[PDB]
Amino acid sequence: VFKKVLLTGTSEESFTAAADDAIDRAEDTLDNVVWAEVVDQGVEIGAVEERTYQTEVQVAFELD
Amino acid sequence: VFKKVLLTGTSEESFTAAADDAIDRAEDTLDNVVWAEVVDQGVEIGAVEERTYQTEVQVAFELD
Amino acid sequence: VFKKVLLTGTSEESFTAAADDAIDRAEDTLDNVVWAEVVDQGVEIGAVEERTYQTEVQVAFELD
Amino acid sequence: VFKKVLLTGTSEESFTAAADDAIDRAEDTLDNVVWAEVVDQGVEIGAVEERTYQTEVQVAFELD
Amino acid sequence: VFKKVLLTGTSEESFTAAADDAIDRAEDTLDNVVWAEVVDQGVEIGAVEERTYQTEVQVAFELD
Amino acid sequence: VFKKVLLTGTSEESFTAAADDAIDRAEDTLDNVVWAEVVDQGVEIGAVEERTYQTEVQVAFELD
Amino acid sequence: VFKKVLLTGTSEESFTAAADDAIDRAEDTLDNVVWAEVVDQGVEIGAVEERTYQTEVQVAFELD
Amino acid sequence: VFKKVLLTGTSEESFTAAADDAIDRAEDTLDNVVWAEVVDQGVEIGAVEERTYQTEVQVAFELD
Amino acid sequence: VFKKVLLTGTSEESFTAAADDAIDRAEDTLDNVVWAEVVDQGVEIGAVEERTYQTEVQVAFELD
Amino acid sequence: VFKKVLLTGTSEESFTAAADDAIDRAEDTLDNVVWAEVVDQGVEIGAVEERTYQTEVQVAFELD
Amino acid sequence: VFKKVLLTGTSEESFTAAADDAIDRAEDTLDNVVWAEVVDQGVEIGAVEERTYQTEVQVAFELD
Amino acid sequence: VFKKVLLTGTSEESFTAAADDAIDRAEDTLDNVVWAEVVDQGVEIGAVEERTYQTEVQVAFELD
Ligand SMILES: [Cl-]
Ligand SMILES: [Cl-]
Ligand SMILES: [Cl-]
Ligand SMILES: [Cl-]
Ligand SMILES: [Mg+2]
Ligand SMILES: [Mg+2]
Ligand SMILES: [Mg+2]
Ligand SMILES: [Mg+2]
Ligand SMILES: [Mg+2]
Ligand SMILES: [Mg+2]
Numbered sequence: 001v002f003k004k005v006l007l008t009g010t011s012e013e014s015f016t017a018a019a020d021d022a023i024d025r026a027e028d029t030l031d032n033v034v035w036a037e038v039v040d041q042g043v044e045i046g047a048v049e050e051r052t053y054q055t056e057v058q059v060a061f062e063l064d
Numbered sequence: 065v066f067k068k069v070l071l072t073g074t075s076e077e078s079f080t081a082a083a084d085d086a087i088d089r090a091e092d093t094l095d096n097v098v099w100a101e102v103v104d105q106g107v108e109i110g111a112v113e114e115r116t117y118q119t120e121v122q123v124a125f126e127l128d
Numbered sequence: 129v130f131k132k133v134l135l136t137g138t139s140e141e142s143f144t145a146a147a148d149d150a151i152d153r154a155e156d157t158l159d160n161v162v163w164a165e166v167v168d169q170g171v172e173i174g175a176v177e178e179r180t181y182q183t184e185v186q187v188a189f190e191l192d
Numbered sequence: 193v194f195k196k197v198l199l200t201g202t203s204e205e206s207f208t209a210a211a212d213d214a215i216d217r218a219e220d221t222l223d224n225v226v227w228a229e230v231v232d233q234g235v236e237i238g239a240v241e242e243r244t245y246q247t248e249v250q251v252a253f254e255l256d
Numbered sequence: 257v258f259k260k261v262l263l264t265g266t267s268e269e270s271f272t273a274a275a276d277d278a279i280d281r282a283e284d285t286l287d288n289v290v291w292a293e294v295v296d297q298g299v300e301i302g303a304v305e306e307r308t309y310q311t312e313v314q315v316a317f318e319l320d
Numbered sequence: 321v322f323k324k325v326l327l328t329g330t331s332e333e334s335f336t337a338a339a340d341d342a343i344d345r346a347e348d349t350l351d352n353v354v355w356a357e358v359v360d361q362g363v364e365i366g367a368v369e370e371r372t373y374q375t376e377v378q379v380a381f382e383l384d
Numbered sequence: 385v386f387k388k389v390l391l392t393g394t395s396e397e398s399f400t401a402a403a404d405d406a407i408d409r410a411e412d413t414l415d416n417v418v419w420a421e422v423v424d425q426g427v428e429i430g431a432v433e434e435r436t437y438q439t440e441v442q443v444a445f446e447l448d
Numbered sequence: 449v450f451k452k453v454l455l456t457g458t459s460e461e462s463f464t465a466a467a468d469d470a471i472d473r474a475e476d477t478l479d480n481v482v483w484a485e486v487v488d489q490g491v492e493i494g495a496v497e498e499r500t501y502q503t504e505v506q507v508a509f510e511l512d
Numbered sequence: 513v514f515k516k517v518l519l520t521g522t523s524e525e526s527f528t529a530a531a532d533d534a535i536d537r538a539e540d541t542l543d544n545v546v547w548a549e550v551v552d553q554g555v556e557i558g559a560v561e562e563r564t565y566q567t568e569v570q571v572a573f574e575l576d
Numbered sequence: 577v578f579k580k581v582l583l584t585g586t587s588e589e590s591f592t593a594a595a596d597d598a599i600d601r602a603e604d605t606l607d608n609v610v611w612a613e614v615v616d617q618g619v620e621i622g623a624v625e626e627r628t629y630q631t632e633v634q635v636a637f638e639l640d
Numbered sequence: 641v642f643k644k645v646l647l648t649g650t651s652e653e654s655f656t657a658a659a660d661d662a663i664d665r666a667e668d669t670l671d672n673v674v675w676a677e678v679v680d681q682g683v684e685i686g687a688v689e690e691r692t693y694q695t696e697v698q699v700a701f702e703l704d
Numbered sequence: 705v706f707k708k709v710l711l712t713g714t715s716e717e718s719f720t721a722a723a724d725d726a727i728d729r730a731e732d733t734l735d736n737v738v739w740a741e742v743v744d745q746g747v748e749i750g751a752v753e754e755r756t757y758q759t760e761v762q763v764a765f766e767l768d
């Protein structure tokens with residue numbers, strides 16, 4: 001059985017690095033993370049100083 | 065990193081109050097709840113006595 | 129077996145009351161209405177005097 | 193010909209009143225606003241003091 | 257309030273049995289599981305020996 | 321001209337048999353049923369004793 | 385209250401004329417047909433002699 | 449950079465001519481219109497005398 | 513078994529004729545073409561002299 | 577690099593067996609088929625004698 | 641009230657830089673740009689010399 | 705007439721480079737490749753040693 005958690009990673013560099021930010025968080029706290037699917041991307045502009053790229057991913061991990 | 069939980073709030077009054085019901089539950093159990101996105105709305109009719117409005121929301125909270 | 133009818137309710141007060149308007153019509157004419165799913169919401173402005181909220185719902189009823 | 197503008201209204205009371213907030217802005221600045229379609233709804237929580245309901249609408253107005 | 261978890265069940269027999277695999281896992285670890293919605297179906301071919309049917313479901317459970 | 325009715329069939333055995341349940345109902349009451357399209361699948365768990373698979377189909381029938 | 389029926393019109397000439405075919409059928413049998421929304425278009429090729437354009441529309445009519 | 453405006457053209461003849469109606473309006477008022485994408489089609493019936501086909505397009509134009 | 517190829521037909525006359533343009537190409541090169549589904553429509557404006565209507569279709573053909 | 581082909585398998589038994597029918601065809605003619613994603617399911621009724629379940633899948637295969 | 645404009649940025653380097661290209665244009669001409677949502681990404685190949693990445697974003701700005 | 709092939713490119717560096725990987729493969733084997741549309745992005749984690757970014761694109765090429 002896989003389960004997925006819906007995480008939004010952030011980066012001031014790129015949408016790929018914001019996806020990695022989410023995946024890195026998942027691998028800090030979960031075992032057997034196996035793949036991630038991008039579900040949305042956006043950029044925070046007027047709530048930060050430097051633009052911050054955001055990549056939301058469903059990160060799947062195998063249960064047991 | 066944000067994470068989102070998918071909750072369905074209920075109310076016998078309105079779709080706004082059913083969204084609040086979900087958000088109130090999230091804020092009971094999670095820190096740093098930051099925003100919620102409505103993903104579906106419906107009304108339970110023939111499983112309750114009074115119609116019950118249901119609002120399903122992805123509720124985002126900031127991790128740490 | 130459930131069947132669904134696609135109805136748009138209207139209200140000059142709110143999207144919840146426009147959903148009820150549809151559901152009330154379904155319960156006038158159908159037996160065993162069991163739940164309704166909101167599929168679209170909108171507001172008529174320049175075809176009415178007062179804005180009229182519209183909530184389109186699939187209303188499900190159990191057959192027999 | 194109709195044209196549509198994509199506006200997000202806000203309210204601390206309800207999703208209907210946040211839709212009205214957008215429509216009121218459109219009618220302040222545009223002639224012949226004729227209808228609005230809800231395209232998304234959400235609630236700002238951790239960027240405000242009181243929750244703020246947001247309703248994004250495409251507001252259509254007739255050209256000429 | 258309901259909450260949903262996004263699980264992918266697997267089976268070497270059928271998409272129905274892969275949905276049951278997910279639901280069985282949810283009922284092992286959660287109380288008051290109430291319904292599941294299929295969100296995607298697929299078949300793993302070249303990472304297994306026998307084809308493995310996969311059914312991804314949002315499984316809803318009532319909170320408290 | 322074809323018309324479609326939106327029916328949810330149920331089965332305690334499989335999603336295929338729940339699709340047949342809907343189609344069988346349509347053919348009980350309609351002439352010239354010609355095809356059905358699956359639009360959603362789900363499983364009722366905590367409102368029944370045995371899990372009940374549900375397959376919602378648009379069932380098309382030719383008019384005249 | 386509006387209700388919508390999901391009809392597929394056909395024409396050997398064009399997608400507009402197939403939409404009219406559906407609408408004409410609705411106006412034969414329903415009062416107060418008010419608008420139709422195109423939901424899908426396709427062409428039957430290998431089940432007919434001449435290609436037949438098909439336009440599926442939700443046709444809305446006002447109830448009473 | 450391209451920008452798009454969301455326009456609904458109308459015609460009493462066809463969905464192609466309603467798309468042209470929108471595009472003609474855009475080219476009256478904008479420079480460097482480069483392409484248009486159809487996003488919805490419908491027919492107004494009970495608000496006009498003759499049916500009026502409507503084609504909504506995102507019309508893209510190159511900025512500068 | 514059916515297989516589908518994703519083709520965009522073009523016409524300077526209409527979206528129906530652009531769908532035919534794709535289908536004609538498929539029937540030039542494939543046997544047993546059986547139906548086509550429209551998946552997108554658009555108009556090329558600023559890359560041509562006369563507007564060119566484009567209709568993208570999945571064209572299905574029966575294998576063997 | 578993976579490439580996907582869009583195939584509709586058929587079966588008179590079940591949607592799982594119709595998915596296998598497509599996959600079996602792909603593995604007859606392609607090397608390194610690695611997974612398949614279900615994209616639509618339906619049932620042919622009034623063009624056959626016995627109902628025929630149809631499962632459309634994107635079947636992915638690794639190139640080289 | 642927020643309003644959004646639908647812009648396609650371009651870059652010969654990356655999809656992140658094409659999103660920035662759009663956002664930079666919006667900030668040249670609009671005050672209080674607050675966030676951008678990616679809605680589509682693509683690559684122009686046979687209309688340019690070097691591939692050009694394109695990122696279409698809805699860019700939101702706060703009105704007043 | 706354009707035709708599109710559905711390819712998933714991979715890269716251990718970025719989603720832009722995974723889109724290029726697909727496009728490079730298409731240009732190895734097809735003439736007149738004209739543009740590509742991103743349809744999905746994901747990251748393989750637990751089937752590789754280093755994360756591998758995947759970008760699925762419909763790559764369009766002009767026929768003749
Ligand atoms: Cl989710
Ligand atoms: Cl429907
Ligand atoms: Cl495809
Ligand atoms: Cl828009
Ligand atoms: Mg930096
Ligand atoms: Mg988002
Ligand atoms: Mg009360
Ligand atoms: Mg729901
Ligand atoms: Mg009043
Ligand atoms: Mg509507």
Ligand SMILES: [Mg+2]
Binds near residue numbers: 204205
């Ligand atoms: Mg107050």
Ligand SMILES: [Mg+2]
Binds near residue numbers: 234
């Ligand atoms: Mg939003």
Ligand SMILES: [Mg+2]
Binds near residue numbers: 268269
């Ligand atoms: Mg076995």
Ligand SMILES: [Mg+2]
Binds near residue numbers: 296297298312
């Ligand atoms: Mg999947």
Ligand SMILES: [Mg+2]
Binds near residue numbers: 332333
């Ligand atoms: Mg049994």
Ligand SMILES: [Mg+2]
Binds near residue numbers: 360362
């Ligand atoms: Mg459902």
Ligand SMILES: [Mg+2]
Binds near residue numbers: 397
């Ligand atoms: Mg003729």
Ligand SMILES: [Mg+2]
Binds near residue numbers: 426
């Ligand atoms: Mg169809």
Ligand SMILES: [Mg+2]
Binds near residue numbers: 460461
């Ligand atoms: Mg005329």
Ligand SMILES: [Mg+2]
Binds near residue numbers: 488489490
């Ligand atoms: Mg519309």
Ligand SMILES: [Mg+2]
Binds near residue numbers: 524525
């Ligand atoms: Mg001509």
Ligand SMILES: [Mg+2]
Binds near residue numbers: 552553554568
């Ligand atoms: Mg297109």
Ligand SMILES: [Mg+2]
Binds near residue numbers: 588589
């Ligand atoms: Mg048999």
Ligand SMILES: [Mg+2]
Binds near residue numbers: 617618632
């Ligand atoms: Mg289909």
Ligand SMILES: [Mg+2]
Binds near residue numbers: 652653
């Ligand atoms: Mg360079």
Ligand SMILES: [Mg+2]
Binds near residue numbers: 680681
């Ligand atoms: Mg695009």
